[PDB]
Design a protein around this nucleic acid. Structure first.
Ligand SMILES: [Mg+2]
Ligand SMILES: [Mg+2]
Ligand SMILES: [Mg+2]
Ligand SMILES: [Mg+2]
Ligand SMILES: [Mg+2]
Ligand SMILES: [Mg+2]
Ligand SMILES: [Mg+2]
Ligand SMILES: [Mg+2]
Ligand SMILES: [Mg+2]
Ligand SMILES: [Mg+2]
Ligand SMILES: [Mg+2]
Ligand SMILES: [Mg+2]
Ligand SMILES: [Mg+2]
Ligand SMILES: [Mg+2]
Ligand SMILES: [Mg+2]
Ligand SMILES: [Mg+2]
Ligand SMILES: [Mg+2]
Ligand SMILES: [Mg+2]
Ligand SMILES: [Mg+2]
Ligand SMILES: [Mg+2]
Ligand SMILES: [Mg+2]
Ligand SMILES: [Mg+2]
Ligand SMILES: [Mg+2]
Ligand SMILES: [Mg+2]
Ligand SMILES: [Mg+2]
Ligand SMILES: [Mg+2]
Ligand SMILES: [Mg+2]
Ligand SMILES: [Mg+2]
Ligand SMILES: [Mg+2]
Ligand SMILES: [Mg+2]
Ligand SMILES: [Mg+2]
Ligand SMILES: [Mg+2]
Ligand SMILES: [Mg+2]
Ligand SMILES: [Mg+2]
Ligand SMILES: [Mg+2]
Ligand SMILES: [Mg+2]
Ligand SMILES: [Mg+2]
Ligand SMILES: [Mg+2]
Ligand SMILES: [Mg+2]
Ligand SMILES: [Mg+2]
Ligand SMILES: [Mg+2]
Ligand SMILES: [Mg+2]
Ligand SMILES: [Mg+2]
Ligand SMILES: [Mg+2]
Ligand SMILES: [Mg+2]
Ligand SMILES: [Mg+2]
Ligand SMILES: [Mg+2]
Ligand SMILES: [Mg+2]
Ligand SMILES: [Mg+2]
Ligand SMILES: [Mg+2]
Ligand SMILES: [Mg+2]
Ligand SMILES: [Mg+2]
Ligand SMILES: [Mg+2]
Ligand SMILES: [Mg+2]
Ligand SMILES: [Mg+2]
Ligand SMILES: [Mg+2]
Ligand SMILES: [Mg+2]
Ligand SMILES: [Mg+2]
Ligand SMILES: [Mg+2]
Ligand SMILES: [Mg+2]
Ligand SMILES: [Mg+2]
Ligand SMILES: [Mg+2]
Ligand SMILES: [Mg+2]
Ligand SMILES: [Mg+2]
Ligand SMILES: [Mg+2]
Ligand SMILES: [Mg+2]
Ligand SMILES: [Mg+2]
Ligand SMILES: [Mg+2]
Ligand SMILES: [Mg+2]
Ligand SMILES: [Mg+2]
Ligand SMILES: [Mg+2]
Ligand SMILES: [Mg+2]
Ligand SMILES: [Mg+2]
Ligand SMILES: [Mg+2]
Ligand SMILES: [Mg+2]
Ligand SMILES: [Mg+2]
Ligand SMILES: [Mg+2]
Ligand SMILES: [Mg+2]
Ligand SMILES: [Mg+2]
Ligand SMILES: [Mg+2]
Ligand SMILES: [Mg+2]
Ligand SMILES: [Mg+2]
Ligand SMILES: [Mg+2]
Ligand SMILES: [Mg+2]
Ligand SMILES: [Mg+2]
Ligand SMILES: [Mg+2]
Ligand SMILES: [Mg+2]
Ligand SMILES: [Mg+2]
Ligand SMILES: [Mg+2]
Ligand SMILES: [Mg+2]
Ligand SMILES: [Mg+2]
Ligand SMILES: [Mg+2]
Ligand SMILES: [Mg+2]
Ligand SMILES: [Mg+2]
Ligand SMILES: [Mg+2]
Ligand SMILES: [Mg+2]
Ligand SMILES: [Mg+2]
Ligand SMILES: [Mg+2]
Ligand SMILES: [Mg+2]
Ligand SMILES: [Mg+2]
Ligand SMILES: [Mg+2]
Ligand SMILES: [Mg+2]
Ligand SMILES: [Mg+2]
Ligand SMILES: [Mg+2]
Ligand SMILES: [Mg+2]
Ligand SMILES: [Mg+2]
Ligand SMILES: [Mg+2]
Ligand SMILES: [Mg+2]
Ligand SMILES: [Mg+2]
Ligand SMILES: [Mg+2]
Ligand SMILES: [Mg+2]
Ligand SMILES: [Mg+2]
Ligand SMILES: [Mg+2]
Ligand SMILES: [Mg+2]
Ligand SMILES: [Mg+2]
Ligand SMILES: [Mg+2]
Ligand SMILES: [Mg+2]
Ligand SMILES: [Mg+2]
Ligand SMILES: [Mg+2]
Ligand SMILES: [Mg+2]
Ligand SMILES: [Mg+2]
Ligand SMILES: [Mg+2]
Ligand SMILES: [Mg+2]
Ligand SMILES: [Mg+2]
Ligand SMILES: [Mg+2]
Ligand SMILES: [Mg+2]
Ligand SMILES: [Mg+2]
Ligand SMILES: [Mg+2]
Ligand SMILES: [Mg+2]
Ligand SMILES: [Mg+2]
Ligand SMILES: [Mg+2]
Ligand SMILES: [Mg+2]
Ligand SMILES: [Mg+2]
Ligand SMILES: [Mg+2]
Ligand SMILES: [Mg+2]
Ligand SMILES: [Mg+2]
Ligand SMILES: [Mg+2]
Ligand SMILES: [Mg+2]
Ligand SMILES: [Mg+2]
Ligand SMILES: [Mg+2]
Ligand SMILES: [Mg+2]
Ligand SMILES: [Mg+2]
Ligand SMILES: [Mg+2]
Ligand SMILES: [Mg+2]
Ligand SMILES: [Mg+2]
Ligand SMILES: [Mg+2]
Ligand SMILES: [Mg+2]
Ligand SMILES: [Mg+2]
Ligand SMILES: [Mg+2]
Ligand SMILES: [Mg+2]
Ligand SMILES: [Mg+2]
Ligand SMILES: [Mg+2]
Ligand SMILES: [Mg+2]
Ligand SMILES: [Mg+2]
Ligand SMILES: [Mg+2]
Ligand SMILES: [Mg+2]
Ligand SMILES: [Mg+2]
Ligand SMILES: [Mg+2]
Ligand SMILES: [Mg+2]
Ligand SMILES: [Mg+2]
Ligand SMILES: [Mg+2]
Ligand SMILES: [Mg+2]
Ligand SMILES: [Mg+2]
Ligand SMILES: [Mg+2]
Ligand SMILES: [Mg+2]
Length: 46
RNA sequence: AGGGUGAAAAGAACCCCCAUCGGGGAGUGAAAAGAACAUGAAACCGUAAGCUCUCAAGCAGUGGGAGGGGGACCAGACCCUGACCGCGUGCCUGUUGAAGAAUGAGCCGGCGACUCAUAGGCAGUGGCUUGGUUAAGGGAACCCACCGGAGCCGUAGCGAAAGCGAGUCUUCAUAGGGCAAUUGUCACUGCUUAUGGACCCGAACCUGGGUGAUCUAUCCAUGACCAGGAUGAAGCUUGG
RNA sequence: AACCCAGAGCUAGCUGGUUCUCCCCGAAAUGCGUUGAGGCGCAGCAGUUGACUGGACAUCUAGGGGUAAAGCACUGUUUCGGUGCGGGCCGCCGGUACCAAAUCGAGGCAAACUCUGAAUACUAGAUAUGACCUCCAAAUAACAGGGGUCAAGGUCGGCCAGUGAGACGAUGGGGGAUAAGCUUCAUCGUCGAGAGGGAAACAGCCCGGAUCACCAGCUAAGGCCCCUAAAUGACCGCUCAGUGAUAAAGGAGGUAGGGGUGCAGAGACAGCCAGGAGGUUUGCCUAGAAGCAGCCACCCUUGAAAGAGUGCGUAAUAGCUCACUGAUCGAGCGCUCUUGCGCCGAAGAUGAACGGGGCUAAGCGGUCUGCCGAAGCUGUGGGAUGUAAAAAAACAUCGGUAGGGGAGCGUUCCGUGUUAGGGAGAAACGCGUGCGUGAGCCGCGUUGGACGAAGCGGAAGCGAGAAUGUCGGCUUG
RNA sequence: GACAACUCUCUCUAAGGAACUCGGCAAAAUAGCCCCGUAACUUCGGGAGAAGGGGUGCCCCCUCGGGGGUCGAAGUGACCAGGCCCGGGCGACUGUUUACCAAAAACACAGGUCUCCGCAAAGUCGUAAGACCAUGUAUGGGGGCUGACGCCUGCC
RNA sequence: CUAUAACGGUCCUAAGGUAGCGAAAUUCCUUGUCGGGUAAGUUCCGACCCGCACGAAAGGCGUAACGAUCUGGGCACUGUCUCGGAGAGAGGCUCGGUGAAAUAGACAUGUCUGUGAAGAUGCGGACUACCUGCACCUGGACAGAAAGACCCUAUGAAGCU
RNA sequence: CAGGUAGACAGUUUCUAUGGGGCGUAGGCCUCCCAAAAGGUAACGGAGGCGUGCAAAGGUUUCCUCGGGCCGGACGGAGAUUGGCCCUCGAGUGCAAAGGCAGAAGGGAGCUUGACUGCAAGACCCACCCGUCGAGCAGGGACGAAAGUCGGCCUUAGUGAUCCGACGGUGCCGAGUGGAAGGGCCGUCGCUCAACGGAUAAAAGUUACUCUAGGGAUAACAGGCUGAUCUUCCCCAAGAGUUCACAUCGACGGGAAGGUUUGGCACCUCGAUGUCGGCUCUUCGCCACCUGGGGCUGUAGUAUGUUCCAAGGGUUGGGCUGUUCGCCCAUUAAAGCGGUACGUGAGCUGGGUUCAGAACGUCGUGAGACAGUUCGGUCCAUAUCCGGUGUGGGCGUUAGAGCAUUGAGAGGACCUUUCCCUAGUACGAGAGGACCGGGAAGGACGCACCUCUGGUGUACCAGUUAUCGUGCCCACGGUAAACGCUGGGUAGCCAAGUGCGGAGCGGAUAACUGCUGAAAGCAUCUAAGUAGUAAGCCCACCCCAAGAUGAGUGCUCUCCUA
RNA sequence: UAUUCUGGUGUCCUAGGCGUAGAGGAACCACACCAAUCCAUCCCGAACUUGGUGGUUAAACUCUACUGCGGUGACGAUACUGUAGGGGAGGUCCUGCGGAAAAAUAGCUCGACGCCAGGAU
């Protein structure tokens, strides 16, 4: 055998998970319409 | 190495277990503090009561908490236990890097290491700045009032030096260049530096002075010892 | 080179150890010199303190250069070609198809070659508000400006540290075997000194830099059959090898596609029927060579077609069969590439060993949308440090080893003090639904039996888990 | 007490007989006494207990060893008590030695040879005084190398 | 005749190894080659000489006797062995009495494989495993008994030349 | 007092990196490359130089152009001197290399001494110490008509801090004062201080007699990484093989795997994590030595050759070695190769770490030394845990028991050689001589066993020696360790003795051989579907076995009294 | 003031150079010829020097023209690369955003600009 193996960090570089697919990279958080302005949390009644 | 019964031996009569020791009562005493006696932590050894483990894999915990128990007054809380699920590669040292199969610690409690003196530098605080300060020494014993200006720091530099001096050395030349044309000090506290063992513990050694020949190495004096058996040199006498 | 004592706490650039808490900042493993290499001096890069400053992050322009690429103008190198002085062999002063400089033509190569020559990098200059609340303009919005606050780089010094064994990864290279988790340099990233998520586990790969609380929310990297959070989602293609965990040359009617080129409707491929002749037994060679041991030639004729013969066969013939042609059959078929995914090549030593179970998708490409996913970001509350000099209110900030700075707690003792308090129970010992960022404090006792706080100050034999420490006590076996 | 494995101190083991093993390590074997016999080799002393063989108890009889009988599987019946032979190296020999991992081929040795020393000697120990050498005197005393006996000991 | 070299030439030294021995306690290559002993011989004996690198008082070559010497072979003999067996004692084992030690971070202390400072009970994935004794066995725990004798360092120590 | 002179004696020194051994080599400076177009930059990376030289090779004024082709010219030739045309920087420049430089920095001529004194703004380089460039100013000059140039050299190497001394100068100091001695200052000289930032003026070895503190920051073994070397293949096919590349070989080259050889690395442990052989004891891999089944053959037969599947079993006994290796003897079916830390040292034992003694050869003056040889030479261990082989208790198994079993799972064993029928039949001209299927005897191994043959048999029985007891004879007893010594021996235990075992027209496969048969109207062992077939795999055989917590099923028994 | 021409003299530059063909003699520049007291040749009045002649555009220089050589040289695209990733056992390949050659060809090129003296218009 004239080929080596992948030890330690080398091996990590090779084997770590990646999304190659151009479509999954370009995804993102959903865009939800804004919320109507909400009331005051707690009010003091005197 | 081995300290502390009580104020006082009042150190426990008498009965019981009973060969003695040891104990349980009674009695002494504020207390038994009962002679292995004063406070009496930890390791370690147990005894009892509450919950719980015998299909289980785990640096023993932690977040969640089934079921069961306990002392409450803010009874929806606290405390003990712990069905099962999740997460969780002892500590130190030292390393590019450790859970390491890298070193170190059996466990528990004590002892155990940047100290002191004196100087130098710097910082922080004061005191004086009619410059600052005293050293040894003297002191109603110490401390301390009051002394003690000898010293020391700051007020002029340049130059090897004579020497000159707000200048001076280098120069034929100030022509240029160099260096100068100003500055507090005495304490206390801290950080560092230096000198002494100088953060602690740890060598093999080095030298000086003694002590050893009852062991062993040689010898010296004077004693003692070596069962039993073989073999048969010289020499000597016999005779060719 | 005895022993004991003394100098002696010898000396040890070496190894081990060096004890309370919280807050802020925070490295280096490089260069030079060294009887130096595991030490040290200075520099580089901490911290704290002052003095000057005006930047940094971006944007554009300008400089010089000789790397990457490229090239043959020089220096080498090199192949063949053209021409050839120059040499070898022969003759007798005669011959040739033999080796060869320079130049030409063609074609290359180069760390120590350059007529050329980038990108970045370096040096320099010039252009441009970092955010947030307010005032605001008849005034609303926005814009403009005033005002206020905050954040942000650098040189020179003072005081005073560590560091001077680095590791891998990306990239450029040298040594080595374009071997090594090897080694040695250069520009960077992470680890060192960095927790969290993804990587089955997994210093150095990817995301992200942890003030703290929350049984809230949105996301990054990465994921969505069950173990195990989210789609047993959607729509296109592919794979049949459990490929989906790894390796090459090479092999191949594997398979799904794409592109050229042959033919054909007077019938193309395969099958089946027949023919496959004459010269001639071609010449040579040979005992023989007759298509078929070997050598050379490989034409011609009759023809629908038939090679002086593709293979078998004979001692040599014969014989079988192929190339090619007519017929039959009636719609595709030939030989070429080339992608994608597979197959074989592919074989080790304790036992599935490639996360498991499993899956023809739960594998692989391509496209669409939901969700999960961290200590990142948001939400709601507390703390601290810097502005900063009381607050309060802002804004920013708060990972951290070596290491530096700030703020504290506790122990014994002294001053106040022959203190307050204490046989109406001190110290100590044991406890706490008490209060602190912690060191700890405050309170309580069916223990204990005589001392002794707080405050405001002072001093140290002042804090222990590590020293094969050390002395006692007690285990384990 | 019991009578496992295994270890150790011991006895025995069919057929074989060193095949074991680094190596016959350890075991087994031999063994006294009397009688016969006894090699190479030699420094003529040895070798030599060479090797190898026979006999052995208890009774009577004869002579002062011999004959006859008789038991036993076995008679020096236990204990005690040599295995031997053929070779080679090294060292002549008996001796000495590393207390506690080495007993030898190392050390010694008789012998050899060199050299110093005439006596108030050389040599050794003492700062010195002096002591040893030696109450000796070159057939003696120091020191160096070699190592019986045999053959020798070459060149520079 | 292949060969070898008594014999010559030259070189250099103070001079160039004579007698005797020789694969040896000396021989590297090397288990030299030959002969013997053995069914088979890296040892042994004899001889060759090509003495890496014998040699003449650091003695050379012989040698009878001697040796708890080193080394080869042979007869006798045997559990040394083929290939183990049985027995006796002292332990081991049970019961009563007395009663240690080295060791020890804490240990609730499986296997395979993978990972990892590159050989894991302790991290991952599977697999296997009721709790706990006793007798035996010694593969592991990088098992235990402190400076690693070997290698390097130290401007260490000592002895010796 | 002086000179000489003994490691007899004393104190000390003996560098760093080599390949972390000897040995010689290297250590400062300069140029080029590496060096990634600023500068800087390492390697035991690749090339070379320097430790000076010139009185002109310096200064200046002024003039000039080298080299290389081709041609002419007495000797004279390839090449000397001379003439001429073409190319234009290819020569030169004291000496390396680099960068420069053509009416020049290159060649010549004339005059010289600036190869000056006093200096110096500012820069570059920079840890420091050093190092480099320099406009400008004054003095006194050289050359030049003058402008101007000149503080050595086209540039970059040609060097050495400090202390100390030496010579020449000097308006300085001069220990009461005057002088002197001696010093200061300026100029300069003196080290291969070359280990070149120089430790002193002055310095080598050795330790296996050794020791201390440390680290393996650095090796020796093993582990890991790597795989050059090694081992096993595959690709191409020049040929060989009567014809014929591919029965069998396969040159020139290529592509791999493995991790067993010799290595590289230094990640690993240094304290007591240690190499090669045997003994005992396993176990696993397959690249298959034999045994089972096949394909091809240049296979007639027997026997081969090569290759495919196959690791269930097997793989002897000796002479020789420290050995891995290897050689032989006699067998054998065959006497396989590897891994497991030499697999195995808290299981055993030899060497090896050649420890201290000694001797030989050799090196060294020497102490001593040797990957030379030789003789001698101490490794301990009561098992805590895991792991194992056995053997119990507890508890579970849903009321408690006693028996009998099913069998998930686990193991043991299924091995092999001759000979004889078949048949001297096929096969072959003969010589030779089968496949297939039957039968016996053996081997090894396993399971038992004691009838026989034995071994032991300290239960016993007999002889017998010495001796002391029982009063003495007789006869017995003790002792001669754990039989005094011998001769026998039953039961037990045991083997060399005796038996027995290895069975399967069961199941499913590997290779291979096949039948029907498409995709490609042909063919094809395969795509559908099936048939044969292996010492292999699984059931059957033999023991264990419901803690098989999934704790099974069956039969029976017992649950009183108040 | 212009313009044209000759000679001198510079600066800028794309470095204007060689070749072929043509033009210039009144002026200007040059050679040609002749003689050597200043000076001159390592030999030579060749060069350099002083003083004459009056010949010629032959050489030289000058001016116009021309791509044959020479010099210069794109646009595009490609190689390379900065940064953000991806593939491969590796040697090395690929993508996005930004920069961007060398070579080769297409073209360009027979310089530009200024002062002085001297003629001519
Ligand atoms: Mg490999
Ligand atoms: Mg991984
Ligand atoms: Mg995403
Ligand atoms: Mg009483
Ligand atoms: Mg009594
Ligand atoms: Mg009493
Ligand atoms: Mg009472
Ligand atoms: Mg009372
Ligand atoms: Mg008490
Ligand atoms: Mg279970
Ligand atoms: Mg458990
Ligand atoms: Mg470590
Ligand atoms: Mg370490
Ligand atoms: Mg301790
Ligand atoms: Mg320990
Ligand atoms: Mg203390
Ligand atoms: Mg200190
Ligand atoms: Mg002090
Ligand atoms: Mg005495
Ligand atoms: Mg005495
Ligand atoms: Mg005595
Ligand atoms: Mg006497
Ligand atoms: Mg006596
Ligand atoms: Mg006697
Ligand atoms: Mg001593
Ligand atoms: Mg001390
Ligand atoms: Mg002292
Ligand atoms: Mg010292
Ligand atoms: Mg910070
Ligand atoms: Mg050091
Ligand atoms: Mg700083
Ligand atoms: Mg440029
Ligand atoms: Mg260039
Ligand atoms: Mg290039
Ligand atoms: Mg190129
Ligand atoms: Mg060229
Ligand atoms: Mg060309
Ligand atoms: Mg280059
Ligand atoms: Mg150019
Ligand atoms: Mg250009
Ligand atoms: Mg840029
Ligand atoms: Mg350094
Ligand atoms: Mg280093
Ligand atoms: Mg790296
Ligand atoms: Mg490069
Ligand atoms: Mg290569
Ligand atoms: Mg560190
Ligand atoms: Mg970081
Ligand atoms: Mg990051
Ligand atoms: Mg943040
Ligand atoms: Mg933060
Ligand atoms: Mg979401
Ligand atoms: Mg789910
Ligand atoms: Mg789906
Ligand atoms: Mg797979
Ligand atoms: Mg035929
Ligand atoms: Mg899976
Ligand atoms: Mg969160
Ligand atoms: Mg947090
Ligand atoms: Mg938080
Ligand atoms: Mg945050
Ligand atoms: Mg605050
Ligand atoms: Mg604040
Ligand atoms: Mg404040
Ligand atoms: Mg912090
Ligand atoms: Mg710190
Ligand atoms: Mg107190
Ligand atoms: Mg007190
Ligand atoms: Mg308190
Ligand atoms: Mg009282
Ligand atoms: Mg103290
Ligand atoms: Mg105990
Ligand atoms: Mg017994
Ligand atoms: Mg006996
Ligand atoms: Mg026997
Ligand atoms: Mg016999
Ligand atoms: Mg013996
Ligand atoms: Mg015996
Ligand atoms: Mg006899
Ligand atoms: Mg004899
Ligand atoms: Mg011998
Ligand atoms: Mg002797
Ligand atoms: Mg001894
Ligand atoms: Mg002896
Ligand atoms: Mg001796
Ligand atoms: Mg005398
Ligand atoms: Mg001797
Ligand atoms: Mg021999
Ligand atoms: Mg040998
Ligand atoms: Mg032998
Ligand atoms: Mg020799
Ligand atoms: Mg001699
Ligand atoms: Mg003899
Ligand atoms: Mg003796
Ligand atoms: Mg037995
Ligand atoms: Mg006993
Ligand atoms: Mg357990
Ligand atoms: Mg690994
Ligand atoms: Mg493992
Ligand atoms: Mg765990
Ligand atoms: Mg064990
Ligand atoms: Mg044992
Ligand atoms: Mg462990
Ligand atoms: Mg040193
Ligand atoms: Mg020293
Ligand atoms: Mg000495
Ligand atoms: Mg650069
Ligand atoms: Mg550079
Ligand atoms: Mg270098
Ligand atoms: Mg000159
Ligand atoms: Mg001037
Ligand atoms: Mg010159
Ligand atoms: Mg000096
Ligand atoms: Mg005087
Ligand atoms: Mg005077
Ligand atoms: Mg005086
Ligand atoms: Mg005087
Ligand atoms: Mg001067
Ligand atoms: Mg030095
Ligand atoms: Mg130096
Ligand atoms: Mg010196
Ligand atoms: Mg020795
Ligand atoms: Mg010593
Ligand atoms: Mg290991
Ligand atoms: Mg082939
Ligand atoms: Mg290391
Ligand atoms: Mg150990
Ligand atoms: Mg196979
Ligand atoms: Mg045949
Ligand atoms: Mg097999
Ligand atoms: Mg097997
Ligand atoms: Mg086998
Ligand atoms: Mg057979
Ligand atoms: Mg072995
Ligand atoms: Mg072991
Ligand atoms: Mg010698
Ligand atoms: Mg011995
Ligand atoms: Mg146990
Ligand atoms: Mg039950
Ligand atoms: Mg049964
Ligand atoms: Mg079954
Ligand atoms: Mg089971
Ligand atoms: Mg069977
Ligand atoms: Mg027949
Ligand atoms: Mg048969
Ligand atoms: Mg029997
Ligand atoms: Mg019987
Ligand atoms: Mg018997
Ligand atoms: Mg009697
Ligand atoms: Mg008796
Ligand atoms: Mg089948
Ligand atoms: Mg077939
Ligand atoms: Mg068909
Ligand atoms: Mg099928
Ligand atoms: Mg079968
Ligand atoms: Mg049951
Ligand atoms: Mg159940
Ligand atoms: Mg141009
Ligand atoms: Mg132009
Ligand atoms: Mg003309
Ligand atoms: Mg042109
Ligand atoms: Mg372009
Ligand atoms: Mg990239
Ligand atoms: Mg350009
Ligand atoms: Mg171009």
């Amino acid at each position: 055998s004239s080929r080596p193996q992948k030890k330690g960090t080398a091996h990590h570089m090779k084997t770590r998970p990646k999304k190659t697919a151009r479509w999954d990279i370009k995804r993102g958080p959903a865009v939800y319409p804004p919320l109507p302005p909400l009331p005051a949390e707690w009010t003091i009644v005197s």
